[PDB]
Write a structure and sequence with these properties.
Neuraminidase, 5-stranded antiparallel beta sheet, 389 residues, homotetramer, host membrane (chains A, B, C, D), binds yttrium (III) ion, binds the ligand CCC(CC)O[C@@H]1C=C(C(=O)O)C[C@H](N)[C@H]1NC(C)=O, globular, binds calcium ion, binds 2-acetamido-2-deoxy-beta-D-glucopyranose
């Protein structure tokens, strides 16, 4: 085997509904299954297999450790995986490492797994290459060192990973790590709008450039948009100029007055957002998702734009279809690419959390839409789950 | 590995009882298992493995989502598989894609999986090659785009698949897709009796010809019998002329008066029907199955005829044996071929549904009969399942 | 890969306790597991893997299909397997074929699986090579066609299998089948004492000879002892002359008066009995087991004799150790050989049935003793199972 | 494949928290899982996989055989394994052999599994190579023949294994076995302080030397420290001279007066103790663990020393971090090494037993710390388990 590289995307002009992973369809009192209580799911693929990752609270439904599964960082939290298509239950899953923030990626030869844990004021990112623990990176703003919550991206054996550190309601200047066979070989300090950037959903815009659509949890409902040159290992960041604000909460589209850099209103709070690339011979499509509701983690819609500079185009994004209706949950979303024989298939997954407050369990299903065929996005996704069962 | 082709069938002159997959033997209140609630089971094999496919309601027994498992098309429905011989439970199964109509096939190199979902008036057939979503085909009569509910058939890397679209009580003109590495490369429009054809059970009658025995749900209890030339990609369809009507409901054998094309009576309603080929040096056997009851989905008998043209022979089909007695359920049946070292073993599977009305769960067992040895078919199959447990 | 042959056994002069497979340790009401209800367990090994076979009633503990699991031949009965060392539960097992009597063996290249089902008066032995159903053999005395209930034996790709047919309290003249790549290529009709022989535990005494220790259920408590020449495909059968009667029930050792052929008393009833070969350069050891009790299926002892002719030696068999004490069940026992890198390891397995009458469940554990090291057999085996749980 | 040898350790200067295997997070009355009741866990790795071993009581939680799971040696006890990262439940585990004391190791080509069972006064160590039972070694001081309770160590296909025999409150002179392809090829009788030595945690200090840190249960709270030359097959043993006594119970550090050989006080009782090597070009680090409490099996601290002779250095060991706080259980600990592509990753596992007295169940979680990155050990481990559930 040899190193993997981004290829031209597979033919198609529309996303369609692909697969639902709803493991809680199986966590009834009256049932006999043990789906793991998770959140922050995400898929990463290699040349032969696609793995469905998530952060588990080390509990199952039905269980007796529902208390604290609405929290985020504890000492029991773990990065787990199953082959995509398998229900992530206690026995099906494999536990990779302790983590309350995670990522993973295949480089053609082997899986890199990333997972941050540690105290809040001195957390610690850890890297595992296949079976071996290989490296770590230390907290630099001493306020909750975090990572992508989605797939990292490897080119010629170099995996690139966003990490961030800083306040949730103040400065969270992010960084990128360059990782080779599990070991950190460069710190890349981005330039530009670096005020606050977290949970980058990165993908290859081409062999030269990784682009990421991130979360600002303090200042704006515009997504910070990262452009990384993987040949000079240089990174720049500016807000997305589009009127189609992709964060949640957000104000009305086009209502943020001023040039492309204006913050301005409803910018505190946020949400991880889907983003994936469709690479064609002489054209690039940028697919995105955002909640159907402006203030709440309900529904998910798919948007798209072809070419241009996202840093300057105020043009509205083309609404492509309703993936999760306003009546269903749509929490985190993320991009990934399945590898066909000679081309890459761009997909967007959606974390569809089952939220009943802190007095019960708290987990998520996963909805997957992929680029397949021509025409219009046809069907929405439901979890099917009743949380009283 | 190289592409697969139909071979001469293994020696034998009789079917025998081979295997029972009854996963609800294990879904008792008192038990500790989770068989998946399914219907439309079907088996397809490649050179080293036979996979047992079904359409699941994304529910298990015992569970709490029995309501709606007597329906057919919903947003939770999925194509699932296990290795044939494994009980399809929550953890053993792999979920392939969202589907309320399905098919699958191996071409020598890889698995093609076919699944239709979407709204009733604009459904959408989707194709997955191994792990990648590769292609789609759109609704053309805007009334419930359907596929085979059984194995597709690949020759020299070209998989051929029946699709139909149309009213259940009127015109449902079918089509064939020719699929190569997961992508559609030709639409084949059949000629002749094309009034209504659905759920074709197709097999290779040879290296030149796919033949299918199908359902007409409107007009006749004679099966539409499709002959597809895979060298010119041309398809012709006519009713089976035999007095041994294979659909359900049906009238008395021989009682449909007139030439081979006469409809005539009890033609509305139907059932998917077993059919598999026994290819000998200079002789072809055609094995079929049909319910033991004339109006109900009870029992299943095996029939056979050697040579001739099914389009013209009114000759009764030879009753070969009672596979499932009149006292047991016999719903859908389908054909498939296991690959021995140097020859192909023709088999017929039987969907044996556990029907207790819409106020309880609704799933199926799977009975398998294969061509093995000489003599007379010896033993019938029972599910052993009591639905009250 | 190439065909397998018997080799010289591994160094050692004593059996020791190896492994217990007691799946019902896990079938409590208060538990969350589903061990399969079985009987007639047996192990067969190939060059990389040892498989643990059993006949299942298609039920689990805890379940609701306990009624009829004390019977033997029904329509739900199946041959199942797990990798030796795995608990045979619903999900771990693979179902091979419908069978109420079975056997299996590896030939170096692939698994042959044998299973008889069918009506009592016209049962049917079926053969499956890997995934394919390949051949069948018909009932010849129209009274319960049966097979070994243990591993068949393959040499240079020819697997040899005892089958019997006939009354349980009268004549049951056995036969041997010679099987190549799943197909029957010769019927071998044994000569000599052929009055009644069933459940042969066969092994290779060398490259030229298969020997079997069998059950007579009518006439004697001496084991019929089969010697098969695999070079001329000829079989001969005579009672075992030893005073150490291996059947159950049996009279006192040495109390059957007359020459080696005398029946005489307590001969009706019987039990399948362990037997395995230790092949050394210029010496052959014959290891056997028999119940600790003379009339009941309680306890199991290991016996041994080096060289001689079992057909003529009235010498007592050397008592080698107590494998299951008189307080624990010892039902069927069987021999098998694990393959080390350059030598074969002879083993004896013991079916330890959990019997509580027909008003509850009826299954078995499996105790394994193998040839390992020097000295005296050290420890006995218990199921650990309380049947009220 | 070829034989494996100790390599230079991977870069790093600190241990960090890696993974928690807490299978009882899933053994609630309210749940639907079956973790196995175990103790004496330990990990051993080969070139592609790390296996998590334990000694099971052949019972699960929840279940009905909690009585006797606080004992140690019974006839049901087994050596079991899962792939490290998998929860050891009934179905995930593989049962290797009956054992109430165990070890295992990869040699580059295959797994050796070691397991002692038998009566107290004539126990029996058994060896299995892959699938085959290959050899045994007999009790020599007729008082509980014991082995390491952790990974053996293979160099050039020779696996070396500590065994001990003797009273728990008197003389237990240990021995080493040298095992090749599952067969014993040399007995090594150590010299020096051989009064009492059990449960050696051995690793390669280099290509020439295995070193072990062991338990004296009678005489001292200093660990016996074994140095084995694998080129001349000679072993020597002396107390560790450090003031940082690693056993439990123990007195105050430095308070044992006299030279390096002084016993003296609180020496009865003991605990198996973590110990792993960090091999650098021209420097060796020795990492150890010991309970946070002086008398109780509570907490676990990581210690380290670079170079010197542990037989003579009274220097205090460097306290490196708190792995399990005083509030959590810290029973047995052990060392092991994961294999990265070109270097070995030293790790220390911690048995974190759930002890509620003999009137309830008794099993353990497993905490893993590995050498990864630079800086200070950052986070402690908790089981998360409430034993009332
Ligand atoms: C750390 C700040 C960040 C934004 C508030 O918290 C995230 C919000 C979450 C959320 O908004 O869904 C869930 C994440 N588990 C959480 N992250 C971590 C690493 O704990
Ligand atoms: C669309 C009508 C058609 C036959 C009239 O429905 C089928 C009948 C069924 C049946 O005849 O058993 C069950 C099938 N699950 C169903 N098909 C779909 C695709 O939903
Ligand atoms: C045909 C009778 C014969 C001996 C009495 O049968 C065996 C007896 C049995 C027994 O004595 O345990 C159990 C076996 N399952 C049984 N075989 C069948 C095929 O039913
Ligand atoms: C035999 C003496 C030894 C030290 C007292 O006992 C050990 C005590 C234990 C303990 O002290 O944790 C657990 C061990 N499972 C047990 N050993 C065996 C091999 O059965
Ligand atoms: C990227 O580079 C590799 C060669 O290194 C090439 O095979 C691949 O086609 C290129 N990808 C794109 C998207 O051009
Ligand atoms: C079909 O063609 C292939 C060669 O392409 C051949 O190997 C096979 O035997 C043929 N099958 C039949 C049924 O004639
Ligand atoms: C049996 O024959 C084969 C060669 O065909 C040989 O390799 C093997 O050692 C022989 N077995 C015995 C037990 O002599
Ligand atoms: C040990 O020896 C082998 C060669 O046999 C070598 O490859 C390896 O690097 C050596 N290990 C150390 C720690 O020096
Ligand atoms: Ca925001
Ligand atoms: Ca009809
Ligand atoms: Ca008898
Ligand atoms: Ca001590
Ligand atoms: Y399970």
């Amino acid at each position: 085997p040899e190193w993997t590289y981004p290829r031209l995307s597979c033919p198609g002009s529309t996303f369609q509904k692909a697969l639902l992973i709803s493991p809680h369809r199986f966590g009834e009192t009256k049932g006999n299954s043990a789906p793991l209580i998770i959140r922050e799911p995400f898929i990463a693929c290699g040349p032969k297999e696609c793995k469905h990752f998530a952060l588990t609270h080390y509990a199952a439904q039905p269980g007796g450790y529902y208390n604290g599964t609405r929290g985020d960082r504890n000492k029991l939290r773990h990065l787990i995986s199953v082959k995509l298509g398998k229900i992530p239950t206690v026995e099906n899953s494999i536990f990779h490492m302790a983590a309350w923030s995670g990522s993973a990626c295949h480089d053609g030869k082997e899986w890199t797994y990333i997972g941050v844990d540690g105290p809040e004021n001195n957390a610690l990112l850890k890297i595992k290459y296949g079976e071996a623990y290989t490296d770590t990176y230390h907290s630099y703003a001493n306020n909750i060192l975090r990572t992508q919550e989605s797939a990292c991206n490897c080119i010629g054996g170099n995996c690139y990973l966003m990490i961030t550190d800083g306040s949730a309601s103040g400065i969270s200047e992010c960084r990128f790590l360059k990782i080779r066979e599990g070991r950190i070989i460069k710190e890349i300090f981005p330039t530009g709008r670096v005020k606050h950037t977290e949970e980058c959903t990165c993908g290859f815009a081409s062999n030269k450039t990784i682009e990421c659509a991130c979360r600002d949890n303090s200042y704006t409902a515009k997504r910070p948009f990262v452009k990384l040159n993987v040949e000079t290992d240089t990174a720049e960041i500016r807000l997305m100029c589009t009127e189609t604000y992709l964060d949640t909460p957000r104000p009305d589209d086009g209502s943020i007055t001023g040039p492309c850099e204006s913050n301005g209103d409803k910018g505190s709070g946020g949400i991880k957002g889907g983003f994936v690339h469709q690479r064609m011979a002489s054209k690039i499509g940028r697919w995105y998702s955002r909640t159907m509701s402006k203030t709440k983690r309900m529904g998910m819609g798919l948007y798209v734009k072809y070419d241009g500079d996202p840093w300057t185009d105020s043009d509205a994004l083309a609404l492509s279809g309703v993936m999760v209706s306003m009546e269903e949950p749509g929490w985190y979303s993320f991009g990934f690419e399945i590898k066909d024989k000679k081309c890459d298939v761009p997909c967007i997954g959606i974390e569809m959390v089952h939220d009943g407050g802190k007095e019960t369990w708290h987990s998520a299903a996963t909805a997957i839409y992929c680029l397949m065929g021509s025409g219009q996005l046809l069907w929405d996704t439901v979890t099917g789950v009743d949380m009283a069962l």
